Amino acid sequence: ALDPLSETKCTLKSFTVEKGIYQTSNFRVQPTESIVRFPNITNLCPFG
Amino acid sequence: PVSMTKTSVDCTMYICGDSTECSNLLLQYGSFCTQLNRALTGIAVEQD
16 A cells, blocks of 8 residues: 555566556545435324 | 447456455455456456
């Protein structure tokens, strides 16, 4: 994980990396916050 | 016909909807998906 060259070297499983474009890993945007929702309702308990 | 839609499907995002444990079970099967991705990459660059 040192640098983009090094991800290539690990994915190729070779120390020498020849000319070209190499896919190594997959970019991802990690979920930052969280939201949970449920509808408001007017059905208040008449217990009071 | 000359070309087809160049599509690539990710290992984990397709197989497991961002579950690390499900990913771990998928990694038990070894190099299936990374060879799958490599074959589809071979197709993609091949089409170009």
